[PDB]
């Protein structure tokens, strides 16, 4: 097809050096499945529109689609699965600037409901760290020290949205070079692991240390910040009512 | 004087009365009891049943040319069974005939001294006109012999109505090819109205009908054999016949019922059948009328039971074997196929997810086909996104072939509770195949709701 | 590697025109994996021996291996999965060339979960076959007793020289974990019997088997036919 | 004038902490990693570093003839004293009695030197010992070696003398490559000097306090009087190995494969009798051979001093800290799996790999065999490499019985598997009674 061919070649340029030929082939062969899912989400009207968007790198959606996409986020909250190592760097590494997420650029999240539907079995037990690594298309063994989770609760998510702080990823913000349009993550031939994708404001963790947090997480299971201080897109610090939780995922 | 020879030699004739006038229909060959055919968005399932008819009418139909009459002599052969009999014309002794018109007393019986076709016909014409002039005013019973049948084949409708099918197709119009395809359903009804009957005494001995001049070799020259023994025409009925054809293109199961009711005079389910049906009435001599109003038909039937100088016509006769004076019957044996049809239309499942939760569907259905023997062949199908998580505003269209059945649709949503991880919102078996199967889910995680509605 | 090239090349020659390239390049790129499986089973001593055996199309192996391989067939019996493709057509055989089979213990560990429940017809992915196990899955079961007497007669055979590979092992794509040992087991009823499967299996006692020379023979032991039930 | 009352007054008035003016504070311990590990070929060498403290206050000070120490000598209490390099205070002195403890001598043991310089007291010591020989005829210390300051405090012997007489490789003891131990054999007699009634009584009338200050006497260097010198011979022993067994120190012999290289030295007068063997009984008879007091004479070995202010015994306080280095070497191994049973088997093989961050804390890398839960039939066998730093090795092999109540039973389940060169994990038996074992080669 004309647009899919143009998509194929645009991919070959922006993909980074260390994306295997196998994964890249997988990205090429599954491309239409991800176009169709975006069309059925009414993220775009057609395959063509989706491929033109990937090629143009302008990830621009109708505001009505984004408002409908957010409903499940307002209902259940937002989730960001992380490794232990990446968690500690948010608190301990000074060049990480004591924020969770890339400061004013935000944190990639999915809906909390989508991660509970997917990372747990039918009976609600956490899946193995192997499965979850595979679902999230991260390197083998990345979560062997446990699967940690950031959680914006429903109130925090509604109040963040009232402020107009929820963002959709753009073609130049999103897998590193495997990003696709449609507010959706790319997940291989197993398209059932594709979750919605949005960008939430970063969390300020000024004067907090990973020691205390991880200690609290072994004690209670989670560390929590009542009414946390988020980082608005303009770089400001601003306090928003709600609960932001950090936790180690547990059956 | 060859009387004793005619008697002895006819008596020696050796045949089976049933088989010598047997009429055998062609025997249905290889055929599939169920066929499935896919056109566009349609699935047509043809269904066939093989049926048998065994009748032995003793009133034989008359075509038109006929030179059959009371006391005629004929050959019991193939051509008799096809209403085109072979006469045996020799010289004849005097023969008494009797008409049954009322009020005539001894004038109803006369003796024709040379009982050829011309002479008997003239004697009857004299009887009938004398009755018109001096007896019709001051004495007539209506005698109507009525038959109805769906039409499935030439042989079948011939047996069923006791009427030569060529005359039916000639006067009406029977499309057997369309009937076989399941495209036309046809009923035919025959009103035989007898105004009078002329009868002819049975000869005490076979030779008695023959002049003393006649020899058995003269009879063998004329066709008499064990293969075609002689027949004496004992009765002929005169009157008029009215043929009624009810034709439709509906595949409804009640077309026969709707058709019988219209004929029966039975006075709105049938209105769908009857408004899209066509009606043909023929009065034989051919006063033919086609119409979509059935009263016009009823009017034709009522306006043609009138007997005056419109005369009556030979319409049927009864014969005996000369050797025996036993009534000769014609055994019709044939196979035919009753053909039904049903048309199904493809549909579409329209999924719309407007809830606040993560949902999943399980959508299953079967697709039916028929092998070369007409046995079902179930192909299980399943939606390829079954069990995939969905969030609002997801929506999609799942096409279903016209041959789908056993449609099962389940939508569930992830409550995420320690005791209730997934909750069902919609759980439906035997979903109706319709042009639109609209599957909506909505609500909140704790209070979800949905429905399947059809359009 | 002269062996990989000769292997790769000779498979390229012998495959069927209509096998999709997705199959065909998965087969080429898992070959080293299946060569390793056969070395670990002592079917062959090295990868080159494995490829050389493939390219020669003569799968001959050492008795020591084959008798050790058979220990689980003698212990648990044999198992053939079939879907329909099950009999009423015409030579009342089930094909004197034999029946491809794996050990009963291997199907029972691979096709059931850790509790003991039968997998979803997942099973299609296991036998690398889509939509064919939808009716359900059938299993031909040579019991352990039948099986031992079959081998005393010396009637168990190994496949020799498309997707066949040496080492008495089924190919199964990238998921070599579904590769099972394959052996060839020997070969007046109708359908009707499937009633007895709805009622209960179908068990034949001392059945009449077929041989490499086409003779019938009547060998002590049970033989069952069933729908795999969970 | 008679300076006696000023010298007594001023010395009495001297202001100092006795402990602190002769403090010998050890070499400052530079930053260190408690644990580190290095991979080399199939080896993992782990250096472990433990920080320890020494605190001794000896009142017998090692003498190094490389002199100015002698009974009734005057020295300065400064840092130079604490490193066996005392500064003397030489003035015109007064009659001073000395006493030698040689056995049979009675009142002939005591002798008064009119002017007690080093020469005159050495002469009297010379006469006295000669007479005893003609007409009249031990303290042991052992300790491992970790640093010069520690071995000094542990043996009360200057480290330069040890380093001069026996090779001591401090830099490479720090790498855990050498476990070194040293023993000292310190005897024959003691000459003592009577303590003055008052501080001034050791000085002649010409000695003034100003002259004493010029020769170094201050609150920061108070005057010391040498009251006792011990004489004899010292026998240094060194035991040097390159083993890594924890049992090395128990060397302490003062059975074992470890036996490595040895060294023994008898202190001569001048700077000796250096002998090096690979058998110990040669050394251990060397000590008894070097144990006779003849005209083989006796040399100064240690001495005791008092502060002249109040005749308190002078202790040199050694408060220092050192590092214990412990080196261990591990070797990579192989898990050998062999399946000779008649059932279908599955394995769960799990282990940790261990490393150390630049802070010395352990970093656990979890680790699993990529064929875990794969089904295996007989005669399957394979070799699973384990790196030299593997730890917490878990091996489980399990059987598919296929009974509808025990679909799988554990045949082998070990959880603390020894990392060794060969880890032989064999399973066999029947489906009804499986057998499994782990052996080590």
Numbering used by the authors:
A (entry chain A): 194 to 366, 368 to 445
B (entry chain D): 104 to 167, 169 to 171, 173 to 244, 246 to 373, 378 to 395, 401 to 424, 426 to 571
C (entry chain B): 194 to 276, 278 to 280, 284 to 287, 290 to 293, 295, 297 to 322, 324 to 331, 333 to 364, ...
D (entry chain C): 103 to 168, 171 to 241, 250 to 298, 300 to 363, 365 to 366, 368 to 369, 380 to 384, 387 to 398, ...
Reproduce the article's own wording on this structure:
Group A Streptococcus (GAS) is a strict human pathogen possessing a unique pathogenic trait that utilizes the cooperative activity of NAD+-glycohydrolase (NADase) and Streptolysin O (SLO) to enhance its virulence. SLO is a pore-forming toxin belonging to the family of cholesterol-dependent cytolysins (CDCs) and can disrupt eukaryotic cell membranes with its cytolytic activity. SLO is required for the delivery of the effector NADase into the host cytosol in a pore-formation-independent process termed cytolysin-mediated translocation (CMT). The translocated NADase exerts its cytotoxic effects by hydrolyzing β-NAD+ into nicotinamide and ADP-ribose, resulting in cell death through β-NAD+ depletion, and promotion of the intracellular survival of GAS within macrophages, epithelial cells, and endothelial cells.
Analysis of the elution profiles of size exclusion chromatography (SEC) revealed the dynamic N-terminal region of SLO (residues 35-105) is dispensable for binding to the C-terminal enzymatic domain of NADase. Diffraction-quality crystals of C-terminally His-tagged NADase193-451,G330D in complex with tag-free SLO106-574 were produced, and the crystal structure of this complex was determined to a resolution of 2.45 Å by molecular replacement. Within the crystallographic asymmetric unit, two copies of the complex are present, with each complex consisting of NADase193-451,G330D and SLO106-574 at a 1:1 molar ratio, consistent with the reported solution stoichiometry. The overall structure of the NADase193-451,G330D/SLO106-574 heterodimer exhibits an elongated shape with the C-terminal domain 4 of SLO bound to the C-terminal enzymatic domain of NADase. A common polymorphism G330D, with the presence of aspartate instead of glycine at position 330 of NADase, lacks detectable NADase activity. The buried surface area of the complex is ~863 Å2, which is at the smaller end of the range of buried surface area measures of typical protein complexes. Among the interacting residues, NADase residue D315 forms the only salt bridge with SLO residue R531. The elution profile shows NADaseD315R did not co-elute with SLO, indicating the disruption of complex formation. The SEC profile showed NADaseD315R and SLOR531D co-eluted in a single peak at the same elution volume as the wild-type NADase/SLO complex, indicating NADaseD315R/SLOR531D restores the ionic interaction required for complex formation.
